[PDB]
Each structure stands twice: as structure tokens, then as C-alpha cells.
Amino acid sequence: DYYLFLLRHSSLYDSFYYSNYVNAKLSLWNENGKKRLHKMFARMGIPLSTAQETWLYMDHSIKRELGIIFDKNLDRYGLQDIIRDGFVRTLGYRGSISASEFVEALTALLEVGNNSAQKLTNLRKRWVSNFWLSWDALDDRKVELLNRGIQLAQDLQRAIFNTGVAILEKKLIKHLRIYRLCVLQDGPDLDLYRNPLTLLRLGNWLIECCAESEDKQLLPMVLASIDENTDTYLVAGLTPRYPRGLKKPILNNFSMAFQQITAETDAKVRIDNFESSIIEIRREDLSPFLEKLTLSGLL
Amino acid sequence: NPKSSAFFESMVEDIIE
Amino acid sequence: LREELTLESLSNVKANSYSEWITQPNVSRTIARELKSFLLEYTDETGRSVYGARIRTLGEMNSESLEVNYRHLAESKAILALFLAKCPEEMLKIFDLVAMEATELHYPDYARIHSEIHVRISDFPTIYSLRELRESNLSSLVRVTGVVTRRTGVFPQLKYVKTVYRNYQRVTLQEAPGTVPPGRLPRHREVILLADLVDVSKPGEEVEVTGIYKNNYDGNLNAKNGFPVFATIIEANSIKRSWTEEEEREFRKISRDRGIIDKIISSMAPSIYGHRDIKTAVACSLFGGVPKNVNGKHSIRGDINVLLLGDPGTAKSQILKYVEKTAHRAVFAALVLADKGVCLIDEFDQDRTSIHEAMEQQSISISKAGIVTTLQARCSIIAAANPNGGRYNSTLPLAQNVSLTEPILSRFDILCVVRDLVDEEADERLATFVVDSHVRSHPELQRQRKKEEEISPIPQELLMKYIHYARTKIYPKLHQMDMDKVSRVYADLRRESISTGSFPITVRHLESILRIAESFAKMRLSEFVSSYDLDRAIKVVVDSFVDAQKVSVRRQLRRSFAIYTLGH
Numbered sequence: 001d002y003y004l005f006l007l008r009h010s011s012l013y014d015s016f017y018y019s020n021y022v023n024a025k026l027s028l029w030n031e032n033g034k035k036r037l038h039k040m041f042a043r044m045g046i047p048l049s050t051a052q053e054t055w056l057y058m059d060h061s062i063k064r065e066l067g068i069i070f071d072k073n074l075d076r077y078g079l080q081d082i083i084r085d086g087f088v089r090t091l092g093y094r095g096s097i098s099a100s101e102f103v104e105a106l107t108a109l110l111e112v113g114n115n116s117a118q119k120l121t122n123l124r125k126r127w128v129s130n131f132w133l134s135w136d137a138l139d140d141r142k143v144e145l146l147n148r149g150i151q152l153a154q155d156l157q158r159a160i161f162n163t164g165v166a167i168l169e170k171k172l173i174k175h176l177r178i179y180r181l182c183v184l185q186d187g188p189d190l191d192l193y194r195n196p197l198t199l200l201r202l203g204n205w206l207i208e209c210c211a212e213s214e215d216k217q218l219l220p221m222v223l224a225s226i227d228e229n230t231d232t233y234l235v236a237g238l239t240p241r242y243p244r245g246l247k248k249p250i251l252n253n254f255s256m257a258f259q260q261i262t263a264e265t266d267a268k269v270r271i272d273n274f275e276s277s278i279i280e281i282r283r284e285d286l287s288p289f290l291e292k293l294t295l296s297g298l299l
Numbered sequence: 300n301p302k303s304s305a306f307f308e309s310m311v312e313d314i315i316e
Numbered sequence: 317l318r319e320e321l322t323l324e325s326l327s328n329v330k331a332n333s334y335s336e337w338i339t340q341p342n343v344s345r346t347i348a349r350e351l352k353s354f355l356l357e358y359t360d361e362t363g364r365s366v367y368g369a370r371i372r373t374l375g376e377m378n379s380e381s382l383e384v385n386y387r388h389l390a391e392s393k394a395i396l397a398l399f400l401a402k403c404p405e406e407m408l409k410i411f412d413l414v415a416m417e418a419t420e421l422h423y424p425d426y427a428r429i430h431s432e433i434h435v436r437i438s439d440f441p442t443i444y445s446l447r448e449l450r451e452s453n454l455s456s457l458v459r460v461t462g463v464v465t466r467r468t469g470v471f472p473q474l475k476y477v478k479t480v481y482r483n484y485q486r487v488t489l490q491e492a493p494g495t496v497p498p499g500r501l502p503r504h505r506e507v508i509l510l511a512d513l514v515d516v517s518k519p520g521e522e523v524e525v526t527g528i529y530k531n532n533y534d535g536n537l538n539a540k541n542g543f544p545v546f547a548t549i550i551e552a553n554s555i556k557r558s559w560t561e562e563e564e565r566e567f568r569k570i571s572r573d574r575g576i577i578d579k580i581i582s583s584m585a586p587s588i589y590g591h592r593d594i595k596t597a598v599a600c601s602l603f604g605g606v607p608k609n610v611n612g613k614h615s616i617r618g619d620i621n622v623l624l625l626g627d628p629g630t631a632k633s634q635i636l637k638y639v640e641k642t643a644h645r646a647v648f649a650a651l652v653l654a655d656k657g658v659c660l661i662d663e664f665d666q667d668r669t670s671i672h673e674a675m676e677q678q679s680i681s682i683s684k685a686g687i688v689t690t691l692q693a694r695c696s697i698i699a700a701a702n703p704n705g706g707r708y709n710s711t712l713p714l715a716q717n718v719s720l721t722e723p724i725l726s727r728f729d730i731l732c733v734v735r736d737l738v739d740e741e742a743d744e745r746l747a748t749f750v751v752d753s754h755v756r757s758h759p760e761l762q763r764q765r766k767k768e769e770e771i772s773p774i775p776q777e778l779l780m781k782y783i784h785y786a787r788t789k790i791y792p793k794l795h796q797m798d799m800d801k802v803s804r805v806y807a808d809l810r811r812e813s814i815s816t817g818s819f820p821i822t823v824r825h826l827e828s829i830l831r832i833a834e835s836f837a838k839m840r841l842s843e844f845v846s847s848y849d850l851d852r853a854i855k856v857v858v859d860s861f862v863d864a865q866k867v868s869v870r871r872q873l874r875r876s877f878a879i880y881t882l883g884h
């Protein structure tokens with residue numbers, strides 16, 4: 001199994017192109033990165049028009065030779081970490097799936113399955129129905145629902161990538177001394193980041209990019225997104241992490257910091273999520289809260 | 300061969316960059 | 317067999333002919349070794365081996381044709397260039413088999429991507445028209461230029477005589493009209509295009525071709541002429557016909573300056589004096605608006621259509637010629653060829669009927685003998701006309717002066733009338749400008765620079781690049797604050813139109829106002845429409861609407877509309 005985004009569905013080319021690790025290793029947000037991918041497939045001996053075919057229909061010979069082709073070629077691109085072992089399951093004649101693909105299907109179903117207090121209640125009630133839309137997909141009798149989950153997973157990753165490139169190309173990351181700050185004031189559709197899990201997927205994209213872009217300055221990061229209906233920013237505090245191939249674990253300290261500023265502050269804020277690293281605050285109060293936060297020694 | 304080194308350098312820059 | 321020749325040993329052709337010397341095994345092996353040694357070793361002055369950099373990009377695009385410049389091959393190992401010019405059909409076989417070795421040195425197992433590579437020659441240093449070809453040119457490499465008159469469909473062709481195929485297509489090439497001598501008809505030739513070269517060119521393009529000149533027996537020619545006369549053909553080897561950050565920064569620099577709209581209009585049609593409103597309308601049509609659609613019952617075009625009523629000799633045909641050279645793609649008189657471009661009409665029942673359908677739709681549909689098919693128009697129309705005989709009559713409304721149906725005047729965004737008015741000072745200004753331009757054009761670098769900068773306030777190369785950039789990049793939108801005022805002005809104009817008994821203003825005019833405001837925003841690279849854009853659009857449309865009316869109605873309109881046509 002390969003750390004490639006949904007290999008056995010869509011195509012081999014899309015598997016590399018949307019992989020969260022490959023983007024950090026080859027810088028796919030710009031053309032000098034994309035050309036490296038074209039160059040790789042040309043050297044590997046795979047015709048580029050076949051690499052884009054649906055992986056079920058891709059030719060049998062390439063399918064069986066792929067396991068050796070990677071051993072000869074990933075080293076030249078510094079990309080050897082793609083290779084690993086994992087668990088695969090199959091039932092009758094309906095074809096294989098790995099656990100890594102299964103969990104992406106389930107998370108996608110959680111995210112996208114189908115004055116202020118009432119709207120918040122409606123939203124939080126909608127998110128609970130998706131629990132049962134995911135629960136009913138753990139049954140082999142209901143593979144039909146699992147396929148829908150996979151179709152949603154692909155669109156979610158597409159929309160995430162199309163926001164990440166905008167953040168990096170417009171250089172919206174602000175490099176403060178103690179931590180890195182990023183705030184989304186507008187977007188193609190900013191509603192997708194109103195759910196916590198989607199926001200964390202975007203954060204995990206940016207964290208891989210920041211982890212590989214320079215050897216220096218492993219820093220905490222703060223990410224926020226506005227909502228036009230509440231006029232509140234949804235804020236999340238994220239740790240750094242060490243690369244895949246490299247020894248105690250680090251700890252997320254934003255919890256105590258957000259709690260202390262919340263205990264002190266004039267600001268209109270909410271803390272009720274299980275994960276205390278995520279908070280919410282009104283439009284005008286973001287800047288004084290972040291000012292008091294950076295003035296604090298708790299970061 | 301030294302004269303053809305520029306060719307192989309252009310090939311090796313794919314490894315480097 | 318084992319021993320090889322030196323390059324100096326090839327200086328003497330030892331057999332009775334070139335082809336019978338190239339085809340010998342020791343000579344051929346020597347040529348192969350030398351070509352490979354050139355391709356692995358040639359450099360820029362900066363080192364930076366170009367062919368190692370081209371083979372690299374061959375795989376990056378999954379391509380099939382390597383391109384070699386003839387001047388490089390003539391700059392060292394000159395004898396190989398001479399042999400290539402004399403015997404291309406042999407030399408290129410050897411060169412192709414060397415190019416595959418060189419590409420596999422970068423990309424092993426590239427044979428699985430494509431089985432065979434073709435070398436394309438460029439910059440061959442001598443040129444013929446279709447006059448100078450003679451029998452001595454047979455089987456020699458030649459370089460030729462002309463216009464592509466006719467093109468066949470693409471077909472597969474059997475490669476070997478287990479089976480394999482390749483693509484095939486034939487093109488007819490004709491002498492360009494500027495090259496043909498006076499009082500003579502143009503000549504023709506026919507070109508064969510193979511695997512990688514099919515659909516490289518379109519009918520009516522002006523094209524440049526390198527290839528082998530070749531001949532064969534034909535029974536019908538011999539039968540009709542009564543002499544042993546062979547037929548000839550050209551087998552093509554190669555065929556020939558964006559911006560940087562610096563350009564973007566320069567565009568943004570000039571757009572940040574005040575009055576850029578006025579400067580763009582001033583740069584429009586430099587050779588023609590006066591007629592600023594016509595230049596304004598033409599600029600607006602060339603930039604255009606944004607198309608929109610609402611699947612709930614409505615759609616709005618981005619194109620802007622303009623009609624100009626011209627007195628005899630008031631510069632109409634010259635500005636159409638100017639637009640034809642300025643614009644990116646266009647048709648002059650066929651609407652298929654005008655797709656996403658500008659269409660030009662300089663004079664004027666089935667033609668009008670076609671235009672009726674074209675103005676109502678944005679796409680054309682037709683059926684014939686039970687067949688059904690569709691085509692796209694998607695274009696801006698600029699038209700001009702002569703007002704129902706020798707002279708326009710200002711005492712009458714527009715309909716009396718034209719041969720058009722009423723919906724035509726409804727659906728044109730902008731209407732304007734141009735007249736040869738009498739004024740001694742204007743006549744003197746025109747005459748001085750005309751004789752000055754006449755002297756400045758006389759056949760008898762610094763002179764050109766002075767001439768150019770006196771001609772226009774913007775260099776027109778930058779203006780054409782700017783228009784293309786703005787059209788491809790900029791997509792403006794309205795601001796919701798001042799639209800209440802626009803609705804009030806619309807209602808006021810309608811009330812005033814009814815009050816004087818005028819033909820009423822309509823939703824088409826309001827749509828045109830918004831579209832013209834978008835175009836004005838696009839002209840300065842602004843993604844927002846602004847109040848001054850709406851003001852200018854309102855002035856243009858209101859003045860155009862006023863010009864269509866009878867004289868008494870015109871006076872009442874301008875007396876009331878003063879707070880729109882002049883004030884705001």
C-alpha cells in the first residue's frame with residue numbers, strides 16, 4: 001500500500017497528483033512541480049495517456065509490473081517513502097479495497113452526507129444525520145452507499161487542493177515570530193470549511209507543505225475562516241510534526257492558551273467542542289483576541 | 300569524456316533540482 | 317566491416333554518385349558515429365548544451381519529433397550539411413536512427429512510449445517561390461512559402477507492404493498574392509502530410525514548408541499531353557507559419573495612471589482625424605462585456621454590436637480596415653469564422669435574414685434533406701451603411717434613413733450617425749492633417765521612432781497585447797450600491813419618453829448600459845464597475861437613443877436629459 005490518494009479508484013496519474021505527500025515532495029502547486037511528474041512518468045516507461053485511464057481498466061501488464069517499476073525510479077525523485085505494507089480485503093467477485101481507502105470513504109460521508117442559535121442548531125443537527133449515513137456503510141450488504149462515499153471523497157480532495165494553491169501563490173501565510181498565521185477572508189466556496197473535519201483536512205495539507213519547504217523553524221500554526229451568516233471566525237490551532245522517514249512526541253499547547261485568553265477576555269467567544277484546540281469568535285473580536293494571544297507567553 | 304559533459308549535466312540537473 | 321573512416325577521408329566522394337557513396341556500410345557507420353558525436357556535444361556560448369535540453373523536453377511532453385537547426389549542423393561538420401542538402405532521403409534515415417539512441421540515453425525504455433522518432437529540419441538557408449522550381453531540384457531539399465488553398469480530411473494509410481498504419485493528409489499550396497508578378501496568374505503545388513504533421517494548418521493560412529521535391533509517372537498526363545511528362549509533389553519534413561511578468565507589470569503601471577480610458581480611445585485609429593465617439597464605440601466593442609446566464613428563463617450576451625450611418629467618404633471603410641488589422645480574429649464583408657471574434661460589414665434579402673437569425677440567437681442551427689446540425693456565432697458585429705441614397709435627412713427619425721427592420725435597431729447596442737458638416741476651421745484642420753500624413757508616408761531607425769511616437773500616444777504593439785491580455789484575464793462585476801439610482805434613472809427616462817410621445821426606452825437599453833459599463837471597467841483592467849463607468853455608459857446610450865428621434869422630440873429630450881447627457 002502506497003500513501004497515494006485512492007489508488008484503486010480514479011487513475012494512477014490522479015493517485016500521484018492529489019497525494020498529500022507528493023505535493024510536499026515535488027511542489028505541485030506550480031508548473032515547475034507539475035513538469036517533474038510528467039518527467040517521472042516518461043522515464044518510468046508508462047505512456048502518459050494510459051496513466052490517466054481508470055485503474056480498473058488499465059492494462060493488466062502495467063498492473064503486474066508496477067511493483068518493480070517503483071523500485072527502479074522513486075529514488076531519483078527522493079520519493080522512496082511511497083513504498084509500505086498494508087491490509088487489503090476482498091469479497092467474492094466484486095474487487096479489492098484497502099483499509100486506507102475505506103477510511104477516506106467514511107470520513108467523506110461524515111463531511112458531506114445529506115436567529116443565530118436556531119441556525120447553529122439546524123447545522124449541528126444536520127451533522128448528526130451523517131453519523132447514521134456512515135454507520136449504515138459498515139455493512140457488506142450496503143456497498144452501494146460505500147461507492148457514494150468514494151465519489152464524495154474525490155470531490156473533497158479536489159476542492160481542498162484548489163484552495164491550497166491560492167493560499168500559497170498569493171502568499172497569504174503571515175510569518176510572525178512565534179507562530180504562523182493564516183486567515184481566509186474569501187474563497188470559491190468558503191462554506192466547506194464550516195465543518196471541523198474539512199478544516200482539519202486543509203490544515204493537514206498546509207502542514208505537509210510547511211514541514212518540507214524548509215529545514216528550519218518547526219512552528220505552531222493558526223488557521224481561520226469567516227462565515228457571512230454568523231459573522232464569526234472558526235479558528236483551529238495546529239502543531240508541527242516531523243517527516244515520515246525519520247524521539248518523544250510533541251504536545252498541542254493551544255488548549256491552555258485559548259482557555260486563558262477566554263477566561264480573561266472581553267471578546268464574544270464559544271468553547272464547547274470535544275477537541276479544545278478549535279474555537280469560535282465574532283468578526284470584530286478576532287484581532288484583539290489574537291493580539292492578546294501573541295502577547296501571552298503561553299504559545 | 301569531458302566534451303560531452305554538458306549533455307550529461309543537463310540530464311543530471313533533473314536529479315538535482 | 318570493422319575499420320572506420322576519418323572525417324577527412326569523407327572529403328573525397330569516391331563512388332560515381334552521392335547516394336551510392338552514402339549507402340556504403342563503412343561510410344554509413346562513419347556518418348552515424350559523427351552525427352551522434354555532434355548531438356551529444358554541441359553547445360551555446362554559455363555551454364548549456366541545447367540538444368541535451370531538447371531531448372529532455374521531448375519526454376516531458378510525450379512527443380515524437382526532435383527539432384534540429386540547420387545552422388548548427390553547418391557550423392561544425394560542414395560536409396554532413398552538404399550531404400543532407402544533396403541526399404535528404406538517405407541522410408534523414410541515418411539521423412533518425414541516431415536520435416533514438418540519444419533520447420534513450422535520457423529515458424531508457426522510451427521505445428514503449430513511441431517506437432520511432434522523426435528529425436525536423438529548421439532554418440534551411442535558401443528559399444524558392446513556386447516559380448523557380450525546375451527539374452534540377454528533383455530529390456533535393458527545398459524551402460517554400462504560400463497560402464493553403466484546400467485541405468483533405470485525415471485518413472489512415474498502410475505503413476508496410478501483421479500490419480501497421482500511419483496518418484495521412486494532402487494540402488494544396490498557392491503563391492501568396494504579394495509575391496506574384498503583375499499580369500500573371502498564381503501557381504499551385506500539392507503537399508503530402510504524414511503522421512505527426514496532420515492538421516498542423518487550416519485553409520486560408522499563409523504557411524512556410526520544408527521538404528523533399530519528388531516526382532512519379534502518371535498515365536493520364538502522358539495520354540493528354542502526348543509527351544513523356546512526369547508529375548511532381550512536395551513531401552513535407554517540417555511546417556511553419558503569451559507574455560512575461562514584465563508585460564503584466566507594465567500593463568498594471570499604465571492602468572494605474574489617470575485617464576487611461578481616454579488615452580486608449582485617443583490611440584484608436586491613428587490615421588483618421590476626429591470622430592471621437594466612433595473611436596469610443598469601436599474600443600468598447602473590441603473590449604466587450606461578460607456573458608451571463610440564469611437557467612431560470614434568461615441569458616445575456618457579452619458581445620457589443622455597433623452600427624454606423626455614414627455620409628459618403630466619412631472614413632467608415634478605413635476604420636473597418638484598421639479594426640481588421642487591430643483585432644485578434646475577424647471576418648470582413650461566414651459567421652462561423654467570426655466565433656469569439658469581431659464581424660465587420662461595410663455595405664449592404666437572404667443576407668439580412670441570416671443576420672436576423674444571428675442577432676436573435678448566439679448559435680446557428682440548420683437542417684437539409686433530413687440532416688440536422690448546429691454551429692456557433694458568439695461574435696460582436698460592427699456594421700456601416702449609406703442612409704437611403706446620397707444624403708441623410710436630420711429632420712426625420714432613423715427608420716426613414718435606413719432599409720432595416722425595427723428589431724435590428726432595437727438589438728444593436730449602439731447607433732451613431734456621421735455627417736460631412738461644413739466649417740472652415742474643421743476643413744483646414746482636416747486638409748492640414750491629410751497633406752501632413754501624405755508627406756509622412758512618402759517612400760523617400762530614428763526616423764521610424766519619431767514618426768511612430770508622433771503618430772500615437774500608445775505604441776500599438778503594446779495596445780494589441782494589452783487588449784488580448786484584458787480579454788483573456790479580466791472579468792468585471794457590478795457594485796450593488798448605486799443600482800437603485802440606475803433603476804430610478806431608467807424609470808425617469810421612460811416617464812420622460814412617454815411624456816413627450818417618444819418611442820419608449822426598453823429593457824434592452826438597460827442591459828446595454830450594464831454591458832457597456834462592464835466593458836469600461838475591463839478597459840482599465842478593473843474587476844469592479846464604478847459610478848463613472850455607469851455614467852459614461854448612460855451618456856453613450858442616452859445620446860445614441862436621442863440621435864434616433866425626430867427634431868422636435870430631439871429638442872425636448874435634450875432639454876430634459878441635460879442632467880444625463882452632460883451632467884450626472
Ligand SMILES: Nc1ncnc2c1ncn2[C@@H]1O[C@H](COP(=O)(O)OP(=O)(O)NP(=O)(O)O)[C@@H](O)[C@H]1O
Pocket residue numbers: 587588589590626627628629630631632633634702746750
Ligand atoms: N481624416 C479623414 N477624414 C475623412 N476622409 C478621409 C480622412 N483621411 C482620409 N480620408 C479619405 O476619405 C475616404 C474615407 O472614407 P471612406 O469611407 O473610406 O471612403 P469611401 O469608402 O470611398 N466612401 P464610401 O464608399 O461611401 O464608404 C477615403 O477615400 C480616404 O482616403
Ligand SMILES: [Mg+2]
Pocket residue numbers: 629631632633634
Ligand atoms: Mg468607405
